[PDB]
Each structure stands twice: as structure tokens, then as C-alpha cells.
Amino acid sequence: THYTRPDVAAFLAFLNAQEGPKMEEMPPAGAREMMRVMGQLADVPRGEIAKVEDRMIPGPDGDIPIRLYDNRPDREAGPVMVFYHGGGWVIGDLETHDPYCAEAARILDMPVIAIDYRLAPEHPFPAAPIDCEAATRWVADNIACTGLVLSGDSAGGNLTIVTALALRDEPAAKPVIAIHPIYPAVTTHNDWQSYRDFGEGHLLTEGSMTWFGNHYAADPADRRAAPIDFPADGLPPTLLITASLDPLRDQGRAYAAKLIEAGVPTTYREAKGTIHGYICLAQGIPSAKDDIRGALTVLKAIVAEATGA
Amino acid sequence: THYTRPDVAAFLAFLNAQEGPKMEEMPPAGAREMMRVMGQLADVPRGEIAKVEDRMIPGPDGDIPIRLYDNRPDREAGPVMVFYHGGGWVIGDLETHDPYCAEAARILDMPVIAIDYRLAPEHPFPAAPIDCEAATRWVADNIACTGLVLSGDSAGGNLTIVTALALRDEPAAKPVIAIHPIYPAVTTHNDWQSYRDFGEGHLLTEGSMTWFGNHYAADPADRRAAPIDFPADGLPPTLLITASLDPLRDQGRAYAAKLIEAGVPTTYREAKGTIHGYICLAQGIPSAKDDIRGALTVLKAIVAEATGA
Ligand SMILES: NCc1ccccc1
Ligand SMILES: NCc1ccccc1
Ligand SMILES: NCc1ccccc1
Ligand SMILES: NCc1ccccc1
Ligand SMILES: NCc1ccccc1
Ligand SMILES: NCc1ccccc1
Ligand SMILES: NCc1ccccc1
Ligand SMILES: NCc1ccccc1
Ligand SMILES: NCc1ccccc1
Ligand SMILES: NCc1ccccc1
Ligand SMILES: NCc1ccccc1
Ligand SMILES: NCc1ccccc1
């Protein structure tokens, strides 16, 4: 039917055989625990890294936790990545995406600063965008860097694009030199062939998407929810990656196409035969390691071209 | 106004001051000579390269001249680039694009084979696509290689895409690994904002485009003229570059967007503040050297990822 990598199909079959409630049948605290446990079982470890540090920074509606990863702390000032995790604006935290952030720091050879932004339903829309924009501006002001590289997965891919638009309109202390949205959401609408094709049996389901969206309570007319409905001109060079079996695939394609139509230099990658969520499934789906390394190698080159110009 | 690099504006002012007939006021033989002279004055030299060889190959209508460039002739079999020069399907030859082809061979560290395909009006459409396809199949059958990288500028960027579509539908003896259309034409129509904005004073003009089109006499309904009107699914990884002051810019953007909407892995670059034809203007417009190097560095990486998988 649809091209599926053998290791991905193996993982889906393992998923399907598990007993216990679906995420959508759980309170937020249970869902949060489910994702932590899934990462413990199906993601790789942090691995060796020179420096990881946690602190709190000021934010407009309270303090924001952030985590710095750096495998070469005696570096000269250069690019810094600011990372927003996924989790449907409800789940995920600094631990769920810790393996990926450490790997990104190692491959990219830049510091990675992960943001622990406020989550729904305790803090509904627009808390996540507000925190992500404030933390990103804080990094520009307070960290030695020459420019910012924004990135994140899923909900965090949404936040990447939203925050890049915010900084385009009102620059931070340092420019955004590149962005890397990973299987992002860019609209609330579901009128996509990929949604029809992959909205069941591929981890991110119609059920889970409804559950997340009901808790987040986004305004579908606000650019901070639905950036595809707003001009993309003047955004930084973009690396956008989708997964081929992902309900969100077609909207990601559409956003990348929109960037190109606005003259934004754009690299589009599609992880063929894998699913939404792969960046935190690198033990369960070993091929994810190649998707991660592939994309980050290309991002490192985009950033090098920017810093060499 | 429109963003123009200072060195580009300098070159346009020099162009504007030149006396003598416009290309479109000339017979084809005169236009051909004009382009050769322009390259002698405004392009860099071939430079040092280990091997350049000429031969004839058997094409459908007679001998097709080809030229092989290789800076490492003792190499093991690997990818080979097949290059189709531009010139509006009327002008250009193996000398007009010789500096670029030698530079491509040096940077890519692969052999480059340039094709001297049949030109209009002596040989109208579809002679050029026929020759380009036949020569590409010849290379796959007769040159030691593992796969093909197709590339070309302007009319040659059209021929890149058309040839890749033909080989998708009926594979050659070696797969097409990647394609690199450079400021391509992908349709016969002129309903584009970039055409209205840059159709005068930026080298490729409304007048020259009409003159080329009239000689080539393409069928606007045929995929070998207007690839944008036909499915792009299943094409190889694509690096498409445009120039920001080019009448063809918007159709190039549109074709790259179409590739992404078909799931083709696509790298889109836009040479900001420069014109159509820059790859043969690297002495007149020194910044063209950076546009050339930047694209070929990216292409080298695309090919390495393909061949490493
Ligand atoms: N050195 C600033 C910092 C510390 C910890 C986490 C993020 C940023
Ligand atoms: N984007 C976080 C996620 C992954 C898989 C399933 C649901 C949510
Ligand atoms: N961020 C995961 C997601 C996508 C679409 C709708 C709801 C949740
Ligand atoms: N339906 C949830 C959602 C919210 C914001 C952006 C995309 C999707
Ligand atoms: N130093 C490059 C340059 C030349 C002319 C005008 C502006 C800039
Ligand atoms: N001719 C170089 C230059 C351009 C602008 C301002 C100062 C110097
Ligand atoms: N020295 C004459 C000149 C300089 C730059 C571009 C065109 C012509
Ligand atoms: N006689 C060798 C050769 C091969 C390809 C192109 C030119 C020459
Ligand atoms: N292929 C357009 C063109 C015309 C004249 C000189 C250079 C380039
Ligand atoms: N109008 C000239 C032309 C011919 C073929 C393809 C594109 C443009
Ligand atoms: N290949 C140069 C060109 C483009 C469009 C129309 C005519 C010629
Ligand atoms: N960049 C000076 C120049 C202008 C025209 C032709 C050759 C060189």
C-alpha cells in the first residue's frame, strides 16, 4: 500500500500489540508519563556530552526553564540553536527530547538551548508561543552568539516557524540565520490527503490530534497557530523535513512550497517510509538515526554558508 | 526598487553602454558569435584541469559532439555529470560554457560531459530534447559510471528537467542520482510577475526571449517544452537555483514548489541580487564565482548522500 521501512513496520506492530489506554483516554499527567516512559524504552540515551546546564530565565508570565547542551564549551561566539520540543502543546519536557538535543549539539557543533515552555491545558494558547518568543529573545540578549538557529519537532516545528515570524517582524539582538522545523504543524485544518491516508495506525492519530487540540484551544485565525495563512517573505533559510507516513506531511510540503514562492531559500527533505515522531524513537526505529544525522548534516552546512558570507 | 548587487549593477551599466545591434536584430550565426565574444570578455578562463577530451557520438540525426572534463582521470567509477548548455535553444556551444564545466568538474570531483545538441532554427523543437536524451543514454551505456547527475542552465535547465522525466519513465542503463537545473525555463507562457519586472534591462529580455522562442518553435502542450504542466512525482533529488532579477525566476520557484508537493527532495536556492546567465559571467560579475561555488558545494553533498545510502 504505502511504502514503509521494515524497521518502522516492526515498530508499529510492537506498538499495536501493547495493552493499556490510548493517550486520548488519559488525563494530561498520565499522557505526560506515557511519553516519558516511551522515550526511556524507544529512544537512545543522552550519550557523552561535555556540558549540560539548567537554569531559569525571566519571562512575561513567569520564569521559564531552559537547558543548555554544548559539546565544545571553549568555542568562540558563533551560532546557537534554540529548540522547542514537541508533544501537541500538552506533553513533552526537557527530558523527553534530551537525547535528540545532545545529539544535535554533537553533530552541529553549536550550543543547543532547549525551552521548557508552558503547556496546555494549564496554560492554553497562546502561552507556548509567548514563552518561546520570550526565551528566544532572552538567548539573543544574554548568550554569546552571532545568530540564532531555531528548531523543533511537531508542535515545536509550529513554534519554530511562529517564532521566526515574530523575530522577522521585530528583530532580536541577533539575527535568525536559519530555521529547521521538523514535521511541523502549520494550520489547524485537516483537509489533506496525508491526513486521510495516515490518520490511523501511524502513532499520530486523528484521536490524539483532537485531544491535543482541545486542550491547547488555539485560535485558528492567529498567525501563532496557523502560519501558513500569513506571508512568509523575508524568513531565514529553512530546512523543513517531513515524514512520508505522517498525517502532517502534506501541510509541511505546502509550507515549504510557500517559502519557495516567497523567495526564501528552502531545503525540503522527506523521511521516506517513516512516521511522525521519529526524532525521539531512535532505539525503537534504528533508521531514525540516519534521518537525524542526514538532516543535521545539511543544517550544519546551511549555517556554515550563512556564517561564511 | 529591486535589490541588485553593486557588481551586478556595474556590469549592467557596462552592458547598457555598448553600441551595436541587439541579438534579436541578428541572424543566428551573428548571435552565436556575440555569445562567444561575450564569454571571452566576461567569463573566467578554463583554468587548470587534468583532462579535457572531445569526441563524436552517434545520435539519432548524426554525430553529436561531446566534451569530457575530469580533474581526476585515474578515478574509480562513480557518478558522472551530463551537462546541457543554455542559449535559448539557438546559441551556445561547447566553448561558451567551457569555463563553467571545468569549474564544475574541479569542485564536484566527478567527470562532466557537455553535450553539443542540435540548435534551432536549423533544427527546431524537438531536436534539442531528442539529442539530450540520446546522448545521456549513450553516456550511461558507454562511460564507466555508477549513476548520472543531469544539469544545465536556462534552455539547458529545461533540457535537464525534460531529460530527467524521460529517464524516469524509461530508465537508462544507470539511474539519475540527482538533477541541477540552473535558472530553468519550465513553460512557454510569460504570465509571471518576474517577467513583468525584469523583462527589460537585465540581459535576458522580452525581445531576446521572443526571438529565441520563434526560432525554436516549441509545442506549448508538449512535456518536452512545458514540464511544469506534467506530474513531477518520482523525479530524483533536485537542486534548483534561480536568479532574483531574472524574468524566469517565478517559474523556477513554481517548479521547485511543484517538486516538493510531489514529494521530491528539493533544494531551492535563489541568487539574490543577480541576473540570468551569471554562470558564464564570472569575470564581469565577480560575485558569480560565489553563486557557482555555493551551488556546486551543495550538489556535491546531495550526490554524496545518494551514493552513501
Ligand atoms: N550559560 C547560560 C545558560 C545556562 C544554562 C542553561 C541555559 C543557558
Ligand atoms: N509530536 C509528539 C507526538 C509524537 C507521536 C504521537 C503523538 C505526539
Ligand atoms: N502537534 C501535534 C498535533 C498536530 C495537529 C493537531 C494536533 C496536534
Ligand atoms: N488543532 C490543533 C492545532 C493547533 C495549532 C496549530 C495546528 C493545529
Ligand atoms: N565594496 C563593494 C561596493 C562597491 C560599490 C558600491 C558598494 C559596494
Ligand atoms: N567604493 C566602495 C564603497 C562603497 C560605498 C561606500 C564606501 C565605499
Ligand atoms: N572597470 C570597468 C567595469 C567595472 C565593473 C563592471 C563593469 C565594468
Ligand atoms: N575518447 C574518450 C572520450 C569520452 C567522452 C567524451 C570525450 C572523449
Ligand atoms: N541566454 C540568454 C543570453 C543572451 C545573450 C547573451 C547571454 C545570454
Ligand atoms: N517560449 C519559448 C520556450 C520554449 C520552450 C520552453 C520554454 C519556453
Ligand atoms: N532559454 C531562454 C528563454 C527563456 C524563455 C523564453 C525564451 C528563451
Ligand atoms: N568586472 C570587470 C569587467 C567588466 C566587464 C567585462 C569584464 C570584466
Residue numbers in the entry:
A (entry chain A), B (entry chain B): 6 to 314
Which of the paper's sentences describe this entry?
Herein, we identified from a library of lipases/esterases/acyltransferases and variants thereof a lipase originating from Sphingomonas sp. HXN-200 (SpL) able to form amides in aqueous solution starting from a broad scope of sterically demanding heteroaromatic ethyl esters as well as aliphatic amines, reaching isolated yields up to 99% on preparative scale and space time yields of up to 864 g L–1 d–1; thus, in selected cases, the amide was formed within minutes. SpL is a hormone-sensitive lipase-like (HSL-like) protein adopting the alpha-beta hydrolase fold, with a helical lid domain over the active site cavity with the catalytic triad. The common Ser-His-Asp catalytic triad was located at positions Ser159, His281, and Asp251. Mutational and structural studies revealed that an aspartate next to the catalytically active serine is highly beneficial for the observed activity, which has not been described before, showing that a catalytic tetrad is actually required (Asp-Ser-His-Asp) for SpL for efficient amide formation in aqueous buffer.
Diffraction data were collected under cryo-conditions from native crystals, as well as from crystals soaked with benzylamine 2a or the amide N-benzyl-2-pyridinecarboxamide 3a,a leading to data sets with resolutions of 2.0, 1.6, and 1.8 Å, respectively. In the complex with benzylamine, three benzylamine molecules (ABN1–3) could be placed into the electron density in the active site. ABN3 was located in the nucleophile channel and adopts a position from which a nucleophilic attack on an assumed enzyme-acyl intermediate can be facilitated and is therefore considered at the catalytically relevant nucleophile position. Next to Ser159 of the catalytically active triad, an aspartate (Asp158) caught our attention as it is not present, e.g., in the lipase from C. antarctica B (CalB). Thus, a carboxylic acid moiety next to the serine at the binding site of the amine in the structure seems highly beneficial for amide formation. As Asp158 in SpL seemed to be of high relevance for efficient amide formation, and putatively the negative charge of Asp158 is important to set the microscopic electrostatic environment at this position in favor of amide formation, we hypothesize that its carboxylate moiety may support deprotonation of the positively charged protonated amine substrate in buffer, which cannot act as a nucleophile. By ensuring deprotonation of the aminium species, the amine becomes available as a nucleophile, which can then attack the acyl-enzyme intermediate following the classical lipase mechanism.
